[model samples]
Target: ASPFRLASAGEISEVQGILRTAGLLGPEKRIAYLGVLDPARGAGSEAEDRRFRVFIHDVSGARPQEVTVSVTNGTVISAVELDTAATGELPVLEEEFEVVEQLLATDERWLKALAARNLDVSKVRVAPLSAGVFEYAEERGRRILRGLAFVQDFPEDSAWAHPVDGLVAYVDVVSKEVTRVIDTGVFPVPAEHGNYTDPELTGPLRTTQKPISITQPEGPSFTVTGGNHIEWEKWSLDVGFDVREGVVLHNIAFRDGDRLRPIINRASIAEMVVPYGDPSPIRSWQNYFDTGEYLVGQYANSLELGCDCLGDITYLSPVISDAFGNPREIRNGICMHEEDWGILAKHSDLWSGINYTRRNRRMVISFFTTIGNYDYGFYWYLYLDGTIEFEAKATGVVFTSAFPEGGSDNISQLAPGLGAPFHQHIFSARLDMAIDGFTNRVEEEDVVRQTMGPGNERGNAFSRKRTVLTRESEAVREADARTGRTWIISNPESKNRLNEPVGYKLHAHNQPTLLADPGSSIARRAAFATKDLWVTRYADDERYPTGDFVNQHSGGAGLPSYIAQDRDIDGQDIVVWHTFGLTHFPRVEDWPIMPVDTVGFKLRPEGFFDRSPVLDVPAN
Candidate 1:
């Protein structure tokens, strides 16, 4: 059954009354006001009766009463609550707030270095803030303390219900990159023990997706052997090949990456980029990738998407609701406008195993999780810029009524026409991102040095640089093969519908292009926007990688924003669940106080770079 439908609150209340008459509402008397059957988890049968066991405690000044609700009839369910006291604990985690302020004050120039050109926070006001520890609970059936929340507005919770621009530490759940960084802005805080709030045994980087085969025990950190070419300044940090599973798990709540960046270091950055301009080529959104503008990795058992290896990377914004559940948590009743947030020229995710079919062409990467059966799974998509798209899946409460047709029909004898005859609804959602362009930038000096250094640096600088080269240099070599591919999942039997598998397509993103022209086509320019959501509108299209990008850093004195620490394995109990190359399973134990996260990638054998970037080092 569909968990969500489209209907008004009045029609929904009518159905709620039916359930109340049936005596299904239990215990503490809080109504499960909105009832949307989670499609992948709900029922299609008209006779099914779904109910919520809701409970609410005493409410007092400043302290909101806690509310807990559960689906009564289905074992597969959804739940939510508020622990005001625990919610109150979020104000104390501010030690780094001062540190961020000092760093921003001391080095504004170096700060933007970590940000992609499109995402650099050059003009906005920034502040250094910290997070408070608060108890948080979710449908997964556990509770843990969440961390710092930074908002564009002053003070905490003022914007708790509203966010013009938000930043917070988050967990990354990419295909192979299942690592958790204190994700603020676009930067991944270094996974050093003392750097994050809690000093655990291992860094929080581990494989949460496809964890059935090549298994490693859950640890704070692991080493990678692949060499990815990062075109930053003089800094060439070796992204040694080893995908650690739990490096920096941010086990908390309402995490907004934009706001949390300045809290950790005013240097945190992010950008929103739109690769496709319009949705013309694709009719329904579910067919956008079919226009040859996207490549994606697909999975069927949607439950795998729910694994706790990393944080929820959706674009959804958390908020305090008004009496009617409308997200009225804005500043002085002010709503954030479109031009006020970060947008990039392009964004892509390598872990998703999808790339543009052509090299050097701009593309946007997106990802997300969907629930199915008893397990959750993930999906990924690679989209090119300049294409128009239209895709909206279910998002909002599913309605119920006494209509004879499989539609909503309200009934009330006392108020004749007051009762609705038909109704519809969906689920809660706000995570829609409209983006453009790409975030690739080149440092002119480094280009010259590398072009003139050795193998590929021989002929005239112009001639040799004109063609992409294969070299022994790790970064340079990966840069050559870094081009993406197009993956088309066509329905051989039916070309009109997109319900089959299109194999992965390969594309290159290495061709150099000029800087974005301000008056150029919006498709050619770099910019973006995000709308907060409780449920994604494009639910069907959001099967895999919702969104992801690349980042690089080197260990140094001026790089003070990193969290560095030598881990003590003996101090904590590490669990190993190798779900690589097979099935991905995340147990209840993995949630709430989920182990810190660690994630990374590996390189297939190629002519470029050495066999093992970390081979020269002594084994741990």
Candidate 2:
């Protein structure tokens, strides 16, 4: 059975009727709800299929309450008041957001603030701002909600043209009261001399009519088992998701002859941060830990065939808890398919006038999550040659800050008057290696310049300096292109015919290390970005790079705190944290929507197998 099978339309109606009969829905209660929860673990046998939990928020009740209704076999099983301390399944409902927007629009005080600026309050759009974790005040039992207001009176072509800068609003969801307001008194608006609708002002349009088709006359070479388990050639893994990490692959194994060898127990995007460069008040304080705060998996966008993916893709739905803590199914949350990877290898015999070429194929599982102005596509690829590629593509609107007539020279400009500040997208993945066995070791191999003291008199050569990491404290490493640095995870007991340990090499490309000052608030919150590689003994609870709770968190929670423990890693069951990042300086071409900027890392077989694993691939 599918772990996150989408609830049918009939099931949704049944849930609503159950809530209505329980006096949790309808005009009197004014319940605004969307989502159904998965059956609680151990609730019933695996045979019991028709069980669900739904959450409803009563907005009109004099004393508002959160409702939870459990239904089994089309019958209402239980209806009860949900605990306030418990985090709900769903995010804040759209109607709940309307309440906050209306509060801001009609408030006599804020209305004056709007009137003073000659801005229409009705046109102001309030967007929920995402910080990784709730602050100490909220963590200490206060429900403090926050959002940013952006004016939207400009034409549709430039809807986000105007920004309500320097204003941050905090609300108390339970009390429905407008809390403290912080106004930095900075209303910097971009210049609007050129209308965005004008064809000339909008910039040149580049169109392409090229057609590329990928087809398999024999059908796809991959098979899916139980909707989640995927097997392609020698590669196999189970796809799963959660509220925080979007797509998680587990039980990843590779076939070696008749035996399936465990390569990794689990791998996922532990956390990511986008920190702006502006040193101003609100902008400077903007350090977004997207995964922890917004729960990217909850916001996954369904993929459209042929556009987002090609060639017989299988989509998977994800179940996540909304703001109120009820589970909702995000349809088409993940897509898995086999892709044609051009030529894997080629051989030519000049003397015999013979040529041979072998085409390559790989399995790809992908998902996309939109965090505010930016959208990220997470792609996981498994090649026939036993290589795994974890990549991310950034495509979407850039977060813009107001500038003067010509914008600031300090930052890059996406448009004439918009200053697109510098930012870094740092991603960290927690990979539990099980190469041959669970206990593995990490070695840092650096290609260094060799001295002329050896047999060779010439000093023009370089050699690899292999450093075996003995403990967790010394495993932290960084990528140095000059030194050709690489990290390998290998089993001491597993060796090939040449006596070399079977291993997997961690390879990274286009990796940007964080440049923020170490002591800065943003750097402290995103400490994981400070390193390119981190190895720690496996701990079940330590999943996120940043501490588990990131929203409004003060600091020192996630990777930083874990590294502080400094327990011995050695040959113990270890988890590898590999960080990849990009320092994006917006370009003019990125005005409307940015082009795809991709960055990722790879785990490739390094002497893991005795011979070419894909030798059996068909030449045709």
Candidate 3:
């Protein structure tokens, strides 16, 4: 019954064999990703056909390719090189991240540059970063890393605190050579160490607050079937993880009475763009599509018992296809636990002087991955009140640059000379919504005030304006907090007892979209962040908003290309894309080690249920 049974070890071996025979697998040409090809919007196919999709990358050639192979047949179905040259690189392999600085420090040319700054190899932690799309010749179609240097006084110290600003080395990992060194200007490396991990580094800890504990003494109320298949009360879903996407849930549904109704077919944080606001040449090329570029999932942390999570916990180990076509497990890569979500419902009667309250809880399915300096946590919540929510948590050290001595402050200065610039972590989530059934309709509902005519003779009449999003063009929308805008995806064929389309409403916290200029390189590359919502006619392979190849893309990919057809959306199977994120003008309080900043959206029942589904919850 589970469409998301993870690819078995034997399955990965079988698939890898076919790819190798097809000349798609090698040490340089590696399997970038492997996952079950979704049995989407199709009929007459093998029930839950277990076809696997293989993403192969020519690390040196910067060629990204995709192939679909059927393990049942042990045959390759189709293989296509993603695009022509200049498309961009595939997700940077985990190996690429560590080798860049090692390779960079060896190159005599790069060492000379470092020697000019009196920086030694062992004393520096070169931040292996993506080479942003700058239309430069050396970077085009190359497996390159833009290496930024940071001083590390101690092995355990935070390197980000002492940014070796004004210096960058473009290293070609395949060649194991540093091609170019960019020296913007010589600014003093902040001497102060921003180390909080050491007891002596920070001031005396606050003992004012004592520890509180959360315990589900009876153990978890959730059951794990077939590993990733989870069932908790009225909720049931299959969790999926990949080398690129960290947590992907498929076939999410609810058990109501004797029937199991489907809500979302698939959901995942497809792509995220971190665009720094500093415009100086030293920092202008700072945009990064963390998901598509670095493949954050590959760095998923092995969560601890009491440290990362509390109470009764269940976990699923995620298998990643390492660069050399081997499967590796990130133990506790996916953490599942029950969390208290406060009260689900409360009522107090003034006349009767009686009170009633109902408690709420949610099953938390989550994982955290450290992409270089930033650690991102992705969580999917299924609440007792029939609500589905997704959130992204950003923690870890803030990306830092050197604060110029005389320059007026535009960025947040944490220390005397350390600067944290303004940036936006704009994340786009793809919700393959299957409301009550597969075929659904999308409607944008905005609260509006009447023009104060006969309908509003009292000059105080307001109502919701629902616009049927009939096409992709008209469905490209954004959040309007002034009007309380929301998108309703509903199955036209399914109706609740009230004769209303069974649906779920999407709510996004209004925040700044991408801040790059409309015509800028980053704006074009990260086009998905331009809107709050994108409703497109469903396509099987259109799962990522940043497209498959976004590493050093020259802009105009992903959503901008997926919706190029501008096809019809109403009364058809459509996918919903919501852009939600944190825009940070960094604060001093978020220094050394920062707290988690989160942004997400919720899918609440509009008319999906006949009545309050949790109304019968026993009073607590």
Candidate 4:
């Protein structure tokens, strides 16, 4: 046996830096590669060394020249490049999507309908984005702003701060530039946030079949885990999330040279939402009342900046309806399996509470499984709509724009740029957790479930269900001056911009409670401001049971949070986050009456922190 068993802390860090610097780290490469690394092995012998097999991203072998380094001397092994084949190139689109209310309105027909119903069309505005920054522009005869953008872009190289497959960019819609760039790293690529190979190296939550509680059978269990390790190593960082007891406690170990820290992926540290309901239209392909077949989604979203971090968790488990309106619990890996799940049901509804929260310094990692529930019944996906309130947190709000003077329509006051207008007043943040897109495939068993019924079951019912992977791509940021933070109190005839003249009712959300008041109980939390509703001209004259959609009904007024205020790290205006792989399954009626599906989540930067204090982060 070799004397060395595992890698040392310095060695791991060094190797990670090399990987990242070389632009080989990301979700695409790291997810599968890390899936093979054994966390238990730490840094050991030839077995461990062998794990670092040659990962050539460029199949063409034209770019990277392999270098040979001797493991015995801890030196370069060898360097060579094999370009025997042609390098593949992706096609680029001719015209990019514009970040404007009119664009969104025309693209989504429902939004135009909503605009028809509203008198204050100018009051309704949307955020515009560019690159990963915030900017402003004129749309639909109104001024609009931009906030954050989450999307996928190819060539994950140092085009920005660091190399990442996908990045979340905050922008200022009014100025039309970038404000900040948040690098979440890569998921499937190597060097980035990829998964380790060894099953032992993955997080308990990432690999466990059992949920926070073992009350029922667990669906798709995570057999492979990494990505986390890949990011940690490449970025020279340590990552951990909040967990509860047996439900989500992860007592995984990590070795760094001679030191070690017993890391733990906590249980539902804040909140968990489990939605178990029936999917419409598409009925039971298997036993309708099966329990473990549904997908259990747990996500603790947080907002933190400087001294504040907001965090909240949601868990959902949805099912399908039976013959007589009776609902059946989904069971097995079909619903929870990662590979077999496909989009069957076409319902756009949140599985848990339409809720959001903030934490101090903790980062949230979303968990979801659709293992064996795809083939038998309909595959229902749950979404988390996150409305972030960052008024009194450590990440104090900053603007780099000219707040236009003399607000219009519902707004009483408006300044051209930052430092004027409604600096001391209150502003309500509108955020929506949207399911951008999805990808689903019908396997062999789907046909079996389609034919069988209660008694006349035909085959062995071996259906493979998986959650369609979606990567949000389009994040448009535009600013609207007319209704820029404007709100009309229900009883009062007086109207004023949301953040102006100082005395508007602004509530500081400080805890995990969904209710309006931070001191209120979670069950009674009401985060939305019913009294102060903004006036927007983007309303449509249509009847929507599940509230009016911004993209569809109220034009930009009711759009997602990412579109409102696109910004860059330096307070410029632009689109920060644009992703790829956003997919939605096509159904029977979709051909004639296509159903629009939306899903999303929120981020409370301050909530991730431990306390209401300044956060001290290690150097990147």
Candidate 5:
């Protein structure tokens, strides 16, 4: 029985009502987010009637009032207003965006910037963006949303195609005031429309591909027994939807023999930073924190048009309430299905009478998020051999702007006068591991190039060197496929047949981390992106890679702050944060829309079993 189910539609509203009654939420203050309030589990256990945590946004205070509500006891467990400056900024609400657009209509500076370009003002639209941190004085110690201008030929045209580059507006949604107008004159808008989906714009759709059929007569082998509790083959876990982090899997365990062996306690991609590398004034301040500043899950796709799922699939609906307490859900928010992953194990021995082969199949859980011009597909796979994989697919339109016909490395050309800026999508995945139990330890293994010494007299020998990460400070690491770097999380208490610690190893996909200079604000705000991996001791409140409030935040929070104490982690419950991403150099083919760029990591069993877990299989 997993108590990790997300708050239902009624449950979200109930928590909102409770917070309102407690005077923590009202018109002035409203629920910014409502997610599963995980129960405490360690030496003891707690009641299971559905608990939740509500983050209320006090517009005036520009701070979050976090309240943990207990539905079982019908009371608020705890409540406290976070220090905004120290913690981070509250999530910018959808209302904040709408209000900014309305405010821009009345501002003459924003009007003339568009009118001077000979574009119709009504056809112009404003994209509300997170005010990325900068040294500007007016923005210091304040809540601000940056606005960029985009224009459309008509209501159906793609506004992203024609950007009013080099122009921006900073406004306070709470105080209802225009703070700053950054106008570097205006660059030419793209000559062509960017509505690639329209037949008139990009020609007709492809009719060459034929449909493929997938059938399952006996239906799927997977089962959802206790609501969010999913069990399939030897794998079972709970699925919960978080408005900021999207799908968070909890209590993940694999059945071994008669008992279930724990793999990971909770796992989620807590934060993602998309920092653009362009010296163009407006583009320089383009380090956008997707999960923090803009709520990714809140803007999730209907998913009806998200994943084109095949086979026996079950869709999980996620409830995301508004600041006004109105519950909203995208029907097909989470997609669960199984895929044939080819041969698990195959051998044909002529000497022996043994000839056997076992098929490999995996359970897939995925969701999609649409953030402005870009879309992301996050897919997680659980294999029969106790392996877990996470792949992030980046699709949708690339955020383009007017560039010269000749290309610059800073902004690669997509069209004659338009280009997509060089940007990096850095994602930090929080993996709370419990290989067998909580008392675990981590080690960094690197394959060393052995010199022609006594052990390597032939000059062709290589060896593995593993350094135990016994403390927090020693855990910050970089990915080195050259040396074959990997981090292992092993339970000291659990033992395999050989008396080795039962473990699971984390493998980085070997992608670039943060490219921003260490002295830059981008590096400070997203410090977790500076390295490929970081291992820290467990802390309940330390979830996001970046601090909770990332909108216009100064820096040095989240992972950096969490491990500042350099605490001992030798025999403690540990969490591994793997930061991996793509440093994109846009091509012409990525013009209107881009193909899905896949990046991910793997967690495979190191010594968690005696032998092959799927050795006993009958030929079908």
Candidate 6:
């Protein structure tokens, strides 16, 4: 099989040179990303060699061009300019903030503001101001960049703890000026440091003095092919990165015996919205869709060897573009390794006096992105039992706001002046399922108490209700603990010896849907969060759950609108959207730096194989 390949450094440089030679490269011109356009139906004929699709951005006031060039051989087949940019086209990248950094270095107003707070300007850290920080001027019809301030107590540590509260500055991208400042009358927190030291805290802790280590005397169990493709015992997938979505897996499949069977075509985080609970104007409009507003992959921090991950790990550097469209590499953006998963299975035979246990191993691939005050670790795990786990770990200082009075009655208080408002972290993942093949149907299963009848008079009996959705109209579902509802994307044609359809079951841990008012704008834009599960007929253009233009978008282009079509989804190529989140009511322990609060979901095989897929796994 021809796996999807990322554009290499040489390939990227060659495309740039080709565009430059053709007078396509200029100061006003930029490149979005060089993505792989796989051959139609996985075909490999003379006409269908490997190719790269280069997205060209033209600031010279023209629609972006999608250039398809051959990677197998050097040739530019087509350079077609579209009428408008694609849905998920990111207009701005982090490199555009160089102008903001330069302006902050020289702006007298910012310096005076810092001086007024008795904070050194040089020791300050600057970050992007969310689009919510400013009223989106429909009159202007364009998004303006702004910057927020924070303090770096020491050069070595992160500056998240010392937020320069209430200070915000707007930057003019064209003129390169810090045009406006909003002090908000909110006082900055004291520069005093609350060190994160485990020495004084008494608890069951792993000491730094006695560091536990992981060593594979026989080396790692998985192998990396072509730097990005991963191959474990029975699993294989291609790892890639996007500016908005951090880590993305493409063409994920698992081997059944000697044959590799398709599981999912593409899987990635569609969007994440963290809406604060405070009602003030400054905080009321603080619904932060981290993926849509700020590109997460742009903030993917380079992982350290001995710290971020233990054991032998393979790191992959992602090639990303700047606001100007020039490509650059983010080193160690993704880390992959094999980890022990405690126990896979254990058994005992009383008659024979024989016992056996299997030590479980799973392939883990992960990446970390720090979005403002929160750090998120995105992890994907593949088990030998054909289970795929998608997890998100959130840890960082809470995004706190300052109240004018001693304490606010509306929100919970982490300290005297600071109020950590109620908020929810909702994550939506897009799973393009190709279970057993492409044609599939979503079967909703529920366990209900049996009606009082002669067959079950005690009221202790339960019955299973299974429904195969024949259309997209009936695919939307919510998580019900009372019903113990579950969903499976099953191929009707593929069944096991027991006549059960081969499929993958979807379920979440700590599931919480959107808590916002149904009519509120935040709820409308992220309508996908209103439910736990959604299945739609496959559409290539429908990627983001919150739509592509969510920066200052109203509520017309997301999941709410997509489902409005109400098309037929039965026995069609379908995609599943699973939502999982936490309704975090901040506790005192969440201050300074919050411990990791994890939210995840799993895809467990259901009759995909006649018997246990990992039964042959060696016990060690």
CA lDDT, candidate 5, residue 363:
94
Superposed Cα deviation of residue 298, candidate 4 (Å): 25
* Candidate 4 wrongly placed segments (more than 4 Å): 1-9, 12-47, 50-63, 67-78, 84-443, 447-620
What is the C-alpha local distance difference test score of each model?
Answer: 0.20, 0.71, 0.83, 0.22, 0.83, 0.75
Encode model 2's per-residue lDDT on 459-535: one tens digit a residue.
77766777888877787888897777889999888888899988999987736788788877667777878889999
Please write out the lDDT profile of model 1 over residues 548-585, one tens digit for every residue. 11011011211011101212211111111000111112
Report the lDDT of model 3 for residue 136: 77
lDDT value, residue 508 of candidate 5: 87
Give the TM-score of each candidate. 0.21, 0.82, 0.95, 0.19, 0.96, 0.87
Worst 10 residues of 3 by lDDT: 40-49
Q: For candidate 3, write residues 425-538 as lDDT tens digits.
A: 999889988987788999999998788787678888878988999888888898899999999999989999989899999988988898788998888888889889998888
Per-residue CA lDDT of candidate 6, range 1-620, in tens?
34466646665666676666666667777765455554455364545466666667665556667677775666777887654312333334455555665688688887777778888777777766544423445313333566766677777554545666667777755446567766765575644354466334434666568777898888888887876788898888898777677788988988888888888988999899897777765456677777877768878989999899888888899876554435678888888999898989998999989899998888999999987688999999998888999989999888765544656655666655555778999999999889888888898888877777798887778888888887778888888877878888888888878998789988767377998788786787778889998888878668788876565566767776677788777777888999899888887798777989999899899888889998889868
lDDT of 5 at 533: 88
Tens-digit lDDT track of model 4 for 329-412: 322111122221222223244886443332222213232222111111112111111112111110111111111244222111
**Candidate 5 stretches greater than 4 Å from native:** 43-45, 59-64, 305-307, 453-455
In the range 1-620, model 5's lDDT, one tens digit per residue, is: 55677677887778777777877776787667777767665525545767787778877765677788876667898998777666666777877877777788888887888777887778878888888778787676677888888888898888877888878888888888888777887678887877777878667778998987776789888998666789988898998888989888998998888899888999999999999998887778887788888878888776663236777788898888888776887788889888888889888999997988889989999888888788998899999898999999999888877785555769888766786889999899999988887888999989988789797788998779878899999989888888899999998888999999888888888988899899998999889999998998998788788876787788767898888879888878899999999999988888788988899999999999999787765565
Highest TM-score model number: 5
Q: What is the lDDT of residue 400 in candidate 1?
A: 10
lDDT preference between candidates 1 and 2, better one: 2
> What's the residue-level lDDT of 583 in candidate 6?
83
Q: Which ten residues in a row have the lowest lDDT in candidate 4?
A: 281-290
Worst 10 residues of 5 by lDDT: 40-49
